Design a protein around this ligand. Structure first.
Ligand SMILES: Nc1ncnc2c1ncn2[C@@H]1O[C@H](COP(=O)(O)O[C@H]2[C@@H](OP(=O)(O)O)[C@H](n3cnc4c(N)ncnc43)O[C@@H]2COP(=O)(O)O[C@H]2[C@@H](O)[C@H](n3cnc4c(N)ncnc43)O[C@@H]2CO)[C@@H](O)[C@H]1O
Ligand SMILES: [Cl-]
Ligand SMILES: [Cl-]
Ligand SMILES: [Cl-]
Ligand SMILES: [K+]
Ligand SMILES: [K+]
Length: 177
């Protein structure tokens, strides 16, 4: 299924490419031809044409292809430089988290966990679903993205829904849902 193969693509591209003999460049890209060979170790019926269709059809825009190179657009657990197109349009974004985090966030703003980027969403629904990852008592923070930009921070379009930024200062949080 596309779900099973996409789930494995995400794992390879975000988390364990070396396990499959792949060497991502500094931007997270691997050869799509070698990715087929890697995926075929689990699902031998996969074709390059199939992986390309998965990228084209993916609901979240999880993947990016340029020529012979493919990457996950977000979510990597190893260091990547992601020079995505800037979101200069969004006025308000959302960040899902757990209530226990409010104290630190109110003191220090939203910081990225493993350096790199803080994840934001354009939808309140996606942000809540995201916060459920870290526990039951989820709150969604409203982010004034205009304020963020004016403080000098670039918000980048990492997927159809996901937005990434280096840090969110406390002053840029306009509400809690
Ligand atoms: N044993 C493993 N444990 C943990 N991680 C593993 C494992 N093995 C490989 N990994 C990779 O290690 C990364 C983890 O961390 P993470 O990078 O943050 O990725 C998240 C998501 O990434 P994303 O959607 O935000 O882009 C990513 N993910 C989700 N959907 C994806 C897609 N279509 N294509 C590519 N990736 C997708 O799976 C991750 C979980 O997310 P979660 O939504 O809680 O679980 C989904 C579903 O699995 C789950 N569910 C249960 N049953 C069914 C069912 N019958 N049908 C459909 N869903 C079902 O019910 C939740 C609702 O969707 C990921 O790469 C993993 O593949
Ligand atoms: Cl393996
Ligand atoms: Cl990321
Ligand atoms: Cl909590
Ligand atoms: K990647
Ligand atoms: K921006």
């Amino acid at each position: 299924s596309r779900f099973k193969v996409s789930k494995l693509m995400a794992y390879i591209l975000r988390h364990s490419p070396w396990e499959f003999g792949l060497e991502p460049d500094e931007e997270g890209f691997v050869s799509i031809e070698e990715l087929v060979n890697a995926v075929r170790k689990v699902y031998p019926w996969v074709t390059e044409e199939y992986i390309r269709e998965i990228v084209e059809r993916d609901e979240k825009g999880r993947y990016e292809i340029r020529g012979n190179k493919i990457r996950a657009r977000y979510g990597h657990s190893y260091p990547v430089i992601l020079r995505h197109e800037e979101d200069k349009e969004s006025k308000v974004l959302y960040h899902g988290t757990v209530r226990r985090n409010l104290k630190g966030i109110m003191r220090e703003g939203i910081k990225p966990m493993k350096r790199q980027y803080v994840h934001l969403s354009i939808n309140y629904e996606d942000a809540y679903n995201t916060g459920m990852r870290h526990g039951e008592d989820v709150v969604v923070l409203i982010i004034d993205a205009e304020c963020l930009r004016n403080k000098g921070y670039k918000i980048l379009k990492a997927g159809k829904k996901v937005r990434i930024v280096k840090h969110v200062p406390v002053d840029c949080i306009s509400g809690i849902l």
